[PDB]
Symmetry: D3
Subunit: 240 residues, 6 copies
């Protein structure tokens, strides 16, 4: 391995410069199977990596695991191996009543409720997505006629208190996060997830292109995975 965690060398990538990065290791082969000549390259910890061919060009699919820290490792090591464009495809809970389960969300920038982003840029730096990547994702979405919303996402280091869930062992939330969901809702934030603040900040601050799409699996105020996967693959096609 050329890198500490992924168990990959630059030769393994066959010159690929674009990666699709789902959170779940099990989703990797599913994404790769939509493309040509899919092959498994490696699997270590939460990092499962497949290579495939899109319009004759090699593309990588690599899982990040849950959270900014594991995401930061995958992105950095892929960047060392030559990846320059990163498309995250995820699952999220919507926090707006007009967003329905099954819809797709394209993130322009994220509320940084994570710690890893701070390791790349101070808090005042925006966790903003690459304009070309966002454009490609929005177009891909419309391309298959998915119901699409574009806007801000809250990206949390936690699934529970950081997303103001009380269905927990302790049944309480630290002061800092009390009333936070209502605040983000009032500010128009679409959804919660757990990797975008780290991904977008680390790429935007290092000259790497990143974009973010997710299928809504729940709505906190009130099939889809395959929809979102089709979209991220089609967006990749436009960025090759």
């Amino acid at each position: 391995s050329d890198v500490f965690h992924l168990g990959l060398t630059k030769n393994d990538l066959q010159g690929a410069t674009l990666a699709i990065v789902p959170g779940d290791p099990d989703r990797v082969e599913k994404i790769a199977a939509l493309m040509d000549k899919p092959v498994k390259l490696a699997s270590h910890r939460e990092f499962t990596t497949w290579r495939a061919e899109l319009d004759g060009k090699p593309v990588i699919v690599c899982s990040t695991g849950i959270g900014g820290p594991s995401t930061s490792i995958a992105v950095e090591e892929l960047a060392q191996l030559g990846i320059r464009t990163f498309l995250r495809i995820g699952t999220t809970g919507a926090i707006q009543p007009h967003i329905n389960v099954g819809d797709v969300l394209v993130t322009t920038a994220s509320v940084r409720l994570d710690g890893a982003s701070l390791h790349f840029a101070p808090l005042e730096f925006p966790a903003v997505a690459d304009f070309e990547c966002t454009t490609a994702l929005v177009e891909a979405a419309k391309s298959i006629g998915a119901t699409t919303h574009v806007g801000v996402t809250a990206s949390s280091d936690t699934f529970y208190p950081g997303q103001e869930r009380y269905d927990t062992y302790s049944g309480r939330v630290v002061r800092h996060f009390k009333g936070s969901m209502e605040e983000w809702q009032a500010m128009g934030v679409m959804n919660y997830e757990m990797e975008s603040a780290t991904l977008l900040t680390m790429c935007a601050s290092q000259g790497l292109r990143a974009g973010m799409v997710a299928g809504v699996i729940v709505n906190r105020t009130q099939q889809t995975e395959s929809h979102a996967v089709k979209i991220v693959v089609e967006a990749a096609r436009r960025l090759l």
Copy 2:
């Protein structure tokens, strides 16, 4: 007289307008409105000069913000009260990347929040991000007139001098927090410095208002008073063209 405390405007004055172009300089307001049909001066108090005009048969506002987040926040708030829902900022900027030339046009996707006013609308972790439709329109508009365009992140400072790490000043020094900061933003790919976008983008993105940001490069902090006029005009045509796409 007015339905708002600072701008001296009534809702009837806007005649149903829902989009506003907001330059920083009061003197650029007439310049912008003239590019459009039926310009008429509405009001002028403090740093806020407001003209109405017409675009493809649609009423549009041009209103100056003055320098800085705090005067910007007043203008944006009061226009929103009067019914404005889309704000397009047209400004001047100092570039900090060598590959960016005077005369180029910058479209901001999002801003580093080196301001105080953004914090009155959202905590620091919230991104000072531009609306996607507005940014798209600005980028499409710049390509329409064939300007040299860069799209990316801008640092938005509450100060012209120490916050942009200028040392050619009365004290000649910069507080610890900002020492070495220009080099940091440069390394992080930041295109330029200006003084209003963090406030504008944060206050709009957190209140359901659409906002975009374009600026003409008038200096490069790594590398003509006449060019400053040509660049301005280049940037002005772009924001008007973008406006037409957002009606």
Copy 3:
């Protein structure tokens, strides 16, 4: 001109070292008229500059516009041109019940609810007024017999949510500022305005003298006068 924004040269100031700095560019000529030999020097953006004379000495009057950011430009550029003493004269909203519209407020120091002050000194540094400047303002106010209150001011980068106004487009205020007015009230803070934290910090941290006086125009519970005091204080500071 010797400076980027103000459109002034050092010779323009004619040796002046004291400036009176209103927020409103429209108030400049008004203030300068109270003194001798008033003449317009320049007007660009929110920056209108007149020169005048007080007891035979040249003095500047220059608008800052609204907010710390434009204030920081004006002060820096005036300092480059030789100004050493800055007297702000402003308008304010009182937040104590006992303070009446028409009263005059002299600021000893400000709560830093601004961004620009941080570009000169970290938050722990006090946005404190110069002692001589404050003295002259308080004596001038007792001189003409205005009802004066002396104390701490909250200086905000916003007119609306940072002063906890709810009469707005959104009708809401970000968590950080909910209940803030009541908090400043309990701490004995007199008023809100929008430039003093930046002015006082930038001057106190660079060896410049600054003072701050304002006229109450609203009471969050319930000009010619303030201007008169600021002019008389200037005389005492020449």
Copy 4:
């Protein structure tokens, strides 16, 4: 399942109240193998769970994945299912010259260079290990005669800039982290790893017991002994039943 991620029911644990929590899903079976009647319960995302038996008492082995966020999910959901004691066994880079590759480190408390801990307690709250767990880990280490150091650990949300590595794509480190390693060294900090701040803070602030032990696999100033750290954590678990 009774929980959103781990795919486990309370019945699956069979009354277990203690869990050993490695970072790596592939280490789970190895740990369970040291005990009696090991059986695999589930595997979803980076969460692999086995159950085994220690002195005839049921115990859980469940991987956290890398980082505070996935750790926070594992700990929370395990707590919902009845777990009250958590013992992390990890790998680490030592940052003191006197500490040798292969040594075992027991963490009394962590420097909080993570984000998830803040979702449980404000920064001023200490990321401190439970006294009984720490005592059990030290005694176990003593028991098997391993070279052991006891002290403070730096727990980072990143492997790279948060541990002030410059051998990277960008080759630079954000201002906040420049000179940080030398600072922790001067302050006697033993090592870096990536989950303890979240684990210790979330447990200490919710009445759950947690301890942390790790095998040194690199020395930033300078055979993995994973198996060495593993025997100690199992022996410590025995003392905590």
Copy 5:
């Protein structure tokens, strides 16, 4: 004197490397009196110092006064004079219902509600007690059979608003501290006192060993002389085990 505040020379310590550090200058003699050959060395400001002998070895007793700032001077200056181990013995208010007046609390680590700790290490660094010291205190407590609790302590730069007391001149508490006591209670914090965050941080970040024990003199949800005596016996016995 070899130091700026304590009025002590290295020779005064007679080779001592352990100090017991009460907050109250008046408690110093009481503690020393439990030991052999107690002798008064100096008294300046809030810093009263005695020397004594514990199992034949010289030990120091030195008051810190109230608060991290004076504590930081005493610990620094004692370190210059050769002290490497610091055991604080204090008085505290319990904030858990199950903890009674007269109980003894041993602190594993502290919530840093102080300013002085920040002068030694950034806030993310834990105000954690030395493991050997904590162990000695817990074993000493069991030895004399006191009702003992072991855990986290909130260490505040104020006695009043920082401990959310409203029985005060102003009757109010600044926003940051409103609702704070209930938050610490929910997080299992045992008690409030005013010196441990500074002590534990400054020691843990400089290779010095520190421990912290206190007697409960009030319960904030629900004798003082006796309590003081119990805690003093424990800190002395712990010191014996750390020689």
Copy 6:
């Protein structure tokens, strides 16, 4: 036996005093009181020594705060409960400007808040500003005795050592946050370092109490009994003007 928890004073003991001079050092209390009429010791507990005396026929209090914001905050709170409304701190300080000489007296208009206790009264953005009348009284008093006097900003630290960027210590290092800090304060015109004013000024200005601050310079970082006496004469004269 006491109306307050730490000071050991009842309100009747104050005999209607509404002003207190508050030195840091308990041992300076009697000295200050001896400048006035009918001085009597009231109490001594911990670092809090209190005397009462008479100035121009009016009762006045002298009460030591100990070193640091935390003990200061206790003294001020409990004195305020006892009826004190005006507080004049008299301290010793290290100058950090070349033009300020040893023996000079400094009047503080406001302080840099390098402390923790001030945060327990007001958030950091609130100014640790002195009362205008007290400052005026101190400046006039200083002119009255013809001391060499400077008026300005003071840096108020929770530590004597790393917070004042001293390297003459056991560990010989300073945490990143304070590296290069002294040069920065100097550049900003800060006059001096001491350890109680940020807490005193903040807690007073935010609770309707009057506070002023004067100190004698006993060291200059860039370049003591008599100096003490000079500042003491000034604080007593300022007190006369504030009765």
